[PDB]
Amino acid sequence: CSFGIENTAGGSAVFHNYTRGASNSVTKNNQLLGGYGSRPWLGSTYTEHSNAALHFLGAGDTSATNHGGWIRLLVTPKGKTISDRVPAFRLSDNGDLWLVPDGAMHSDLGLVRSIETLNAAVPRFNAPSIQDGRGLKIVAPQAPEIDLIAPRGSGASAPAIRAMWCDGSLADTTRYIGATQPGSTFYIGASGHDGEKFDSMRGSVAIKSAGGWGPTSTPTQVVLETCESGSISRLPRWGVDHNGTLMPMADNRYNLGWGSGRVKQVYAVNGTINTADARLKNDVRAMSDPETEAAKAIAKEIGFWTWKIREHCGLTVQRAIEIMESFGLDPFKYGFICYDKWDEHTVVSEYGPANEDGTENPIYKTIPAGDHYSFRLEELNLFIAKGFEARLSAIEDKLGM
Amino acid sequence: CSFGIENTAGGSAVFHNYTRGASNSVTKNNQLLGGYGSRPWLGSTYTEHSNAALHFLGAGDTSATNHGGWIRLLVTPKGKTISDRVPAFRLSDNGDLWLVPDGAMHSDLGLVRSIETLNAAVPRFNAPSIQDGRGLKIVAPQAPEIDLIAPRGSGASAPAIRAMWCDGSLADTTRYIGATQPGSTFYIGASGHDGEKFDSMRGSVAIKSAGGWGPTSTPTQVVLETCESGSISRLPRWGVDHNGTLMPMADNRYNLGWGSGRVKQVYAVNGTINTADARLKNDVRAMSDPETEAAKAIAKEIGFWTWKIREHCGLTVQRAIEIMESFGLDPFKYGFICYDKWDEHTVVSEYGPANEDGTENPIYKTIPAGDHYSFRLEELNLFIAKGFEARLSAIEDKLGM
Amino acid sequence: CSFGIENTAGGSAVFHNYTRGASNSVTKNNQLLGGYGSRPWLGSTYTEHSNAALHFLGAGDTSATNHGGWIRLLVTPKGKTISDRVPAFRLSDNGDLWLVPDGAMHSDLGLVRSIETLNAAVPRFNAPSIQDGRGLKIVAPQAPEIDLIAPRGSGASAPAIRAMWCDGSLADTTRYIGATQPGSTFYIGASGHDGEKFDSMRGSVAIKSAGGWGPTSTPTQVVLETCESGSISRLPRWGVDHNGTLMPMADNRYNLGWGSGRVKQVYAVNGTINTADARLKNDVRAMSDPETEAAKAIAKEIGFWTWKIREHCGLTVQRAIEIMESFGLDPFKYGFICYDKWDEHTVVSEYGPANEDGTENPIYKTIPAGDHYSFRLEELNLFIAKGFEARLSAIEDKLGM
């Protein structure tokens, strides 16, 4: 039944495991320094090893400068024997916790306790060891996961992942803690192996302080970052600013939509602001006579059309192209006529239902290669307008007006 | 004071718990196979059970094919007795870690160690058991949470959640690791009970590889996904591409803004590109005489207005509607005249300060029902322009030009 | 070798630590109630304290109403002695798990087991204690982190963080579980110290239920939220709705782009919808003669320009400004002429490669102060159009038409 150690005097009641190296030498790296474990009864014998256990192990060979030690907990899956038991919890000597469930690592890697030791055991892995000592690492086949199960009760289901930024340190005698500083960030993103190693994140969401904080001001922003094909460095692309503006994170560089991914429409209050600054342009030349002629002819093409229930006003780019060429102009040297083309490509179209193999089941779809003819209607309207101006000036001269 | 087991020869110093079933039968499922626990002193006695403890338990009845075993750690909240102690840490036999703090589960569920065993104990729960063996599960009343506390020291507060994608396996007899493959994703999202069960995520942010990776190319994208009312399958909606484009994830399907959520304004460098492709349209018919007449009359309505202060150029939709109808036209059959209506609805307007009941405190607001009359100004300009064209052609004929 | 406790009768085989206060008084808050620990061999002695250990400790002074107790696990980093061992795993009496790796907290704080106890030990910290009992807390210098290592095997690398919403409770006798309710949210965001305390999140991504759920309907939305300079309350800014619309979360409040962060261009199918509602405007006045005169003159400026290879149609704002002023008008009282200026500011331009000090290495860049002259081309076209209308009416009167 019950075995116990008692100290009646007010001191500690503690159990110790004492272990040596061979022939009184120092204890070694990964040597089992101590253990506690259950052995269940099979009917007439106990198991030969523990089915659940706590192990104390060495971290490096013991010496006057190294007393390194780490911990793991071992479990045995239902339906398996102690030959297939799993060191699923490993508390590294650096203080990190590794969670390595059944199926994640071969039993040859049962002594891995860090990125450094994992790199050594799997030479091609090459993850950054600067990530050691930072907290929790989960290794699982395919889909390592954190589930936050949140019953509402009488309030709200509101799971959360919360960074807590501050100035200062909990590591010294002083323990100053102060206001969040500029450059405070929280990245939620993905690193990956590139064929040679893992490195920095190449895609992420980042919540950032937008300046230093004070009791009346705690500004932030949220930024989405991606890495381009043929490149190995991620860039901030789009973000929401402290004032709520949704903006590209570089000027005159990123689009909204593309040929095979067009916005259906925009609801705005004010008109789009387009820069038309003399300092960024060459001189504005007058239109040639063929250009003016084409401008006049294009105005005659304006009518009404439908798609394949309302009547839309305008013309086709193909019609404008024929008119342009009939006056000897190359239509694609003009900014109001656009052509976009794209290759065949595959996209996630939807998600299947959860099944026996996983909960997240993307359904793929192939988008055929294609192309579009398009206008910039603001610039087209101005082209047409110059046509009207030339026609009006010709009339005004004929009436000495 | 101090109790110890010593092995001087270089072997292990290990403690074992040996337990049987009743009458020498096999140990049973959830049977306590071993235990270590503290019992504090009340003045003249010790507590009847341990206030903090490590338990080794069976996972399934022991047999020649099952040596299953799992672990939990128990703690007792300050201000409570050992009747209310909490098995807060449960290392499942599958290797998952369950964190179940005080107030999360009734004591009847102290032996729950998996989604399978939780489903059996709570028949209406019905979570997917495919999620077992994947890592960490946290159960807490209302707001299970992970906090990443990040003192700056002399650097930057930069907490991070990092997926680490790779090809290969750590699980086999030979380990192999290679470059991130196509279809690599990282989902941060929410599943929920639908009245019958939990299933796949129905809203999420997803970081994805955009193609396979190599040492000179590690492309990614970030995608936001939601599920529609009346639907049970989430779809990618908007995303930032590897090249930084912000785009809808299906063509000609999603809007920017709506009637009661209009963008204030857009800053663009180039003019909006609108597709005007003959292949997607029916034939462009000429304008009837009433339509041309309305186009001419509408041009006379252009003046300057202010809101209720710069002078803006244009006219009202209501004025255009009267003119349209005065020539016997239904104005709402034309694409340049729009009407939007919305019901009364309630939204989160802001967040209150943290209080004794929670840190996240949304303040609600009711938006009244309403409607708007709107133009598509690009189309309207073209309608007006055809009016000018007809007037110019009528003049040119009268002067034999 | 092997030390063991055996129970042949079918009962438990358990080890107990029995400890008292001084002079038979009750055990005290944070008193070591029990311990298990390895002591490695240095060559001729063992270490004076354990290099790896499990400790059971008191939570509050023991009494008839308090049997509080908690657990920690201690490890010793390779290259250090037991003077510098780390209580890296602390399972609080409330059931929370604290991960505190090497370098995170001074050894004086080794008994911290909660936000309440941390606040008392570090008076300036002032985090919200309502966060106690919610799950996992990770403290690390600068960059606490969670890594999800996901080898593809034969499937896909698909790590996930998954909130699981439901109605009900697992905490009571009743244990009702039901459908996800309205107001269910999942926040991924950042709190921070403001100089006095930590509080609510001030920037975040939030996945939210958009209404209650049922077996045929599980709507969601994704929202990005930030806090403004000079403010201490975060607001929803932009979101993707259940129907996939990307929208500002308040009407007529937020922009897309700004002067130093302009969208390059927009790809839309339909024309931008601009509200032009008589009910929201003052009366549309007719143009004065100087305004009409300027409108006519501006049409003559339309030609072609290039940036510093295609020919773009239009004119400069500076040219329009001179014409406006030549007829005695203030050009900046008119909505189609815009001027924006911005101060010098610093932004993250790029991410450096991973180095020995960290994986996430932002490279900064200074954007000089600057300004732009811009048009609203839709409004400008209408201004020009009125010029044409006045010219046509003058001709028609002269020919008695």
Author numbering:
A (entry chain B), B (entry chain C), C (entry chain A): 989 to 1296, 1304 to 1396
The authors write:
The well-studied Siphovirus T5 has a three-fold symmetric tail-tube, to the end of which three long, L-shaped fibres are attached. These fibres are made up of a homotrimer of protein pb1 (pb stands for “protein band”). The L-shaped tail fibres are responsible for the initial recognition of certain Escherichia coli (E. coli) host strains, binding to the O8- or O9-type O-antigen of the bacterial lipopolysaccharide (LPS). The bacteriophage T5 L-shaped tail fibre uses an intra-molecular chaperone to fold, which is then auto-proteolytically released to yield the mature protein.
A single point mutation (T to G), mutating the codon of the corresponding serine in pb1 (Ser1264) to code for alanine, was introduced into the plasmid pET-28-pb1(970–1396). Expression of the mutated gene in E. coli cells led to production of the non-proteolyzed version of the protein, which we call pb1(970–1396). The resulting model was used to phase the structure of pb1(970–1396) by molecular replacement. Three trimers were located in the asymmetric unit, and the intra-molecular chaperone region could be constructed by a combination of automated and manual building in the calculated electron density. Serine 1264, the residue responsible for the auto-proteolytic cleavage of the carboxy-terminal domain from the bullet-shaped domain, is located between the bullet-shaped and intra-molecular chaperone domains. In the structure where Ser1264 has been substituted with alanine, the chain continues with a loop (residues 1265–1276) winding around the other three, subsequently forming a hairpin (residues 1277–1322). Three 50 Å-long hairpins (residues 1332–1371 from each monomer, containing beta-strands C' through F', protrude upwards and embrace the preceding bullet-shaped domain). The intra-molecular chaperone domain (ic) ends in a central triple-helical coiled-coil, to which each monomer contributes their carboxy-terminal alpha-helix (formed by residues 1371–1394). In the structure with the chaperone, two short beta-strands are present in the third interdigitated region, forming a four-stranded beta-sheet with the C′ and F′ beta-strands of the chaperone domain. Although the interface between the bullet-shaped domain and the intra-molecular chaperone domain appears extensive, it is only 3 × 103 Å2 large and the association is accompanied by a free energy gain of just −12 kcal/mol.
